[PDB]
Amino acid sequence: IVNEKLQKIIVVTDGMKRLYEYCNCKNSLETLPSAANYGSLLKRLNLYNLDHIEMNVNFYELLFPLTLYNDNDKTLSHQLVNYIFLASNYFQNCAKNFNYMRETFNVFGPFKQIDFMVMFVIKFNFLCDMRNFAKLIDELVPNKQPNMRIHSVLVMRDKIVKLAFSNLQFQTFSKK
Amino acid sequence: SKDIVNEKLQKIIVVTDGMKRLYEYCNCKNSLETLPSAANYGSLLKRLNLYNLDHIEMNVNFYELLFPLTLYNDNDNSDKTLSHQLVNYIFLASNYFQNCAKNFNYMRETFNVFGPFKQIDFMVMFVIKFNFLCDMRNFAKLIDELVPNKQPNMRIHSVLVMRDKIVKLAFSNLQF
Amino acid sequence: VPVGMAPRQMRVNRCIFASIVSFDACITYKSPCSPDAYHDDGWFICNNHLIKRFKMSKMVLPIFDNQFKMTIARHLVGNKERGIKRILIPSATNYQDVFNLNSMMQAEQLIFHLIYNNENAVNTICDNLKYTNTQRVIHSVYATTKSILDTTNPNTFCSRVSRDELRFFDVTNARALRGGAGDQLFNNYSGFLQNLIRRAVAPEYLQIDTEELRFRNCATCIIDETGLVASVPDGPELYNPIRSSDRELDRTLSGYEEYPTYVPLFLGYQIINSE
Amino acid sequence: VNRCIFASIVSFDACITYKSPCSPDAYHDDGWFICNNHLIKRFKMSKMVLPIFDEDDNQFKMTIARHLVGNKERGIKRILIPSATNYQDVFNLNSMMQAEQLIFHLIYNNENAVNTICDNLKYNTQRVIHSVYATTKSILDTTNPNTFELRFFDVTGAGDQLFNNYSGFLQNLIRRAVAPEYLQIDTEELRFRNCATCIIDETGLVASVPDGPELYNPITLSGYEEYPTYVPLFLGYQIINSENNFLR
Numbered sequence A: 001i002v003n004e005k006l007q008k009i010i011v012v013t014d015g016m017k018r019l020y021e022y023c024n025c026k027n028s029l030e031t032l033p034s035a036a037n038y039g040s041l042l043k044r045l046n047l048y049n050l051d052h053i054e055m056n057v058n059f060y061e062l063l064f065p066l067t068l069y070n071d072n073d074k075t076l077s078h079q080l081v082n083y084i085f086l087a088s089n090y091f092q093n094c095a096k097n098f099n100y101m102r103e104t105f106n107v108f109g110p111f112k113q114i115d116f117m118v119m120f121v122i123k124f125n126f127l128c129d130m131r132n133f134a135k136l137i138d139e140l141v142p143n144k145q146p147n148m149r150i151h152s153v154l155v156m157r158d159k160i161v162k163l164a165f166s167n168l169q170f171q172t173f174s175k176k
Numbered sequence B: 001s002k003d004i005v006n007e008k009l010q011k012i013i014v015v016t017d018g019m020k021r022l023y024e025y026c027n028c029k030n031s032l033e034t035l036p037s038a039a040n041y042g043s044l045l046k047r048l049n050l051y052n053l054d055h056i057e058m059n060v061n062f063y064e065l066l067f068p069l070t071l072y073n074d075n076d077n078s079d080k081t082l083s084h085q086l087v088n089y090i091f092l093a094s095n096y097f098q099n100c101a102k103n104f105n106y107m108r109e110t111f112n113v114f115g116p117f118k119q120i121d122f123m124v125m126f127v128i129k130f131n132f133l134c135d136m137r138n139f140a141k142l143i144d145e146l147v148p149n150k151q152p153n154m155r156i157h158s159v160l161v162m163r164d165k166i167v168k169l170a171f172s173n174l175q176f
Numbered sequence C: 001v002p003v004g005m006a007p008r009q010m011r012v013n014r015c016i017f018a019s020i021v022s023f024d025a026c027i028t029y030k031s032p033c034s035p036d037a038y039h040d041d042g043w044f045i046c047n048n049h050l051i052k053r054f055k056m057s058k059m060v061l062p063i064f065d066n067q068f069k070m071t072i073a074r075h076l077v078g079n080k081e082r083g084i085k086r087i088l089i090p091s092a093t094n095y096q097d098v099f100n101l102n103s104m105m106q107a108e109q110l111i112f113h114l115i116y117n118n119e120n121a122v123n124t125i126c127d128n129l130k131y132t133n134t135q136r137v138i139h140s141v142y143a144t145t146k147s148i149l150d151t152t153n154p155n156t157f158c159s160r161v162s163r164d165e166l167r168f169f170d171v172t173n174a175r176a177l178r179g180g181a182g183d184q185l186f187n188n189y190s191g192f193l194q195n196l197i198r199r200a201v202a203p204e205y206l207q208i209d210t211e212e213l214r215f216r217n218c219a220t221c222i223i224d225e226t227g228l229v230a231s232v233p234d235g236p237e238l239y240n241p242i243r244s245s246d247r248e249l250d251r252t253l254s255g256y257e258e259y260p261t262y263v264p265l266f267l268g269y270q271i272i273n274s275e
Numbered sequence D: 001v002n003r004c005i006f007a008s009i010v011s012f013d014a015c016i017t018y019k020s021p022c023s024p025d026a027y028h029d030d031g032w033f034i035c036n037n038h039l040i041k042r043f044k045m046s047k048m049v050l051p052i053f054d055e056d057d058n059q060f061k062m063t064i065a066r067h068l069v070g071n072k073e074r075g076i077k078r079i080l081i082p083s084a085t086n087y088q089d090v091f092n093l094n095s096m097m098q099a100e101q102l103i104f105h106l107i108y109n110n111e112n113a114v115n116t117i118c119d120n121l122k123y124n125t126q127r128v129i130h131s132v133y134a135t136t137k138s139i140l141d142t143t144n145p146n147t148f149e150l151r152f153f154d155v156t157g158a159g160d161q162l163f164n165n166y167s168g169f170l171q172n173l174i175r176r177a178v179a180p181e182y183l184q185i186d187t188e189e190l191r192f193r194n195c196a197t198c199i200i201d202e203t204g205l206v207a208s209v210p211d212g213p214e215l216y217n218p219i220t221l222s223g224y225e226e227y228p229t230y231v232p233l234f235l236g237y238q239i240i241n242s243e244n245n246f247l248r
């Protein structure tokens, strides 16, 4: 299985949006998630305990399926790399200011699971942007037999994102 | 917060108890002594093949997976060898993950011999994680339910950070 | 009286426009070339030609204990400059417009055509220069320009240019939409053009394995269809005090390692790793 | 004759140390009230200036400081100028002399600690501390605007409010180091930076940037000049009033 991941990502994102009755993909983001946009999302999330929330995104594998698209034609060859760097910077800022993000979201109706809420909104906004990009590139055909040489950039940015999440996790844990 | 982390610990115990019989594996005799072998999972691999296994993460959140254990009544001031045992456990877990990542291909041929199916790329990781979680359950059995609401330990957190950085880098290096 | 020993080896001028010579054997000409052209550096254009044509001046950015000094150029576009004036380096689709080829030496016109391909104009010029000595000048100019172009030619081998680096100077502005295409046009850009862009424009960030060094938190120039544009991405242009080429407070303020007033070129991430 | 804050530290005691660690630029009667050594060792900054242009023949050496903070510093290590709420925390009050502790207490409005230290030191020490008071308060009053140019640090007003919260000497230091990304020259607005190099917040001045990672700032092209790699301080929007080329 080297291609089913993309369609399963689409399906699981749709199912999660259904489960939490929220599909606000309209508010595409490039600076920082905010309660100004995701306050109702916080309220919806409070309905169900957010135990299944991870302190990382698995950047590389997460974005790997997007490479499958055929770009023989280039459009994807550069738009995808743009997206990779954008995601890298977005996660950098999110992890760097997670405390600021969580104080803000908590100020919006403090939640016992505030950290879960902030992480989930980060994940959800990223998934919305990713699905918008996937629609932008829905014309291209995903398939295996890859040879990119930009997945090396993907690996590098994934390492950077993992280190950022690592510092974030260390802060959260060490602060009791 | 760390109360949610205690909830995470109890949840992982109960959820291991749950899936070890929902899928009736409990390969609970194995440990992190060295690289696992398909010879101890043949039938378990057959049962795994009954399900699509792409719903798995290439990287391991070694941080969040092991942090809950750090919460224990170290204030008893009776068994500091318990904390040292935890340090040994975390370090050996990091080594186990690092070796699994380094020789992931080797395990790929192993499980090619054992159940040559496309899902082997996920079966290897599932075996790794499931054996690890059985070891976690055994470690939980060894330790006592002395989990406090909150507990700071700089040394343990630092060890976690430095070992998991290697772990995450190794997992990220799994290109394809 | 006369003295001579044997043929001698001397320096080499590395700027393309050094090959500019009047097509006249009876009327001598000497191109104005900065002595920097005689440095075995990536720069295949001398500071004089660079400033004269692309409105750019050479500069060095000494990044460091592990000091690896790297090349960089800087703006010479005035603050009030607009439109075509802002195109720091024209593209093949507009270089004819930006450069008044009609008012310059025909050798220079041929050189610029070679830089921007335009093989049709190149052939027209060669035919005109052949059907009229002038063939010798054809040979000299075209051979030198083509030699330099093939040397740059990043999309080949045997050229000593590609370092397997993956600099993305089309990196998103972080507020534009799904776009960029600067590197698409770069792919289309001539080899000398691409190498000039690489040398002149330093990356915003330097990525080394798992290390990212930040040098400019906002790009100073952009790449678009017209080519390299000396425009601030976010609107209001930076002030550029053009000084040359083309009081008591200060006396009180003795030397304090005064910061330069220039605007170097920052754009993109430069990706290099051990793999 | 020179000028240097913390150079007024006279050997009031016979306790720890004193050698007058003052950079020679203290003799330079610039707009600063602190010299290079003290600036570097108490705010992680280096004095610098900047000319502008000869279009109107101004070329004024605009005052500015250099970041001495790398991209790995966090929190306190990244704070350049602390607020009155955090200066005590960032500064090792137990390391510096009680004279410099008094200077910090005065400049940050901690007269309670000032009097506490005075009373403790009383047991020639009192008169020497009074001399320190005289020098420090003279400097503070000189910097204080309250006596006989819309340099917004927020517009490019919470930031301006924080700057105002700073003392006269501290406000002077902030305005001398920081350089607005925008400067109006009496009805002609000029942009000099497309981005900021520092941020003013509740904790005080921080060598940070609006977004992304921290600017990298560490401690054979021989035939070409060099461009400095360090990061100067940049923040705000200043407007010059109805005044001529006031080279005075």
Ligand SMILES: [Zn+2]
Residues within 6 Å of the ligand: C015, C017, C018, C032, C033, C034, C037, C045, C046, C047, C048, C049
């Ligand atoms: Zn020349």
Ligand SMILES: [Zn+2]
Residues within 6 Å of the ligand: D003, D004, D005, D007, D021, D022, D023, D026, D034, D035, D036, D037, D038
């Ligand atoms: Zn001094």
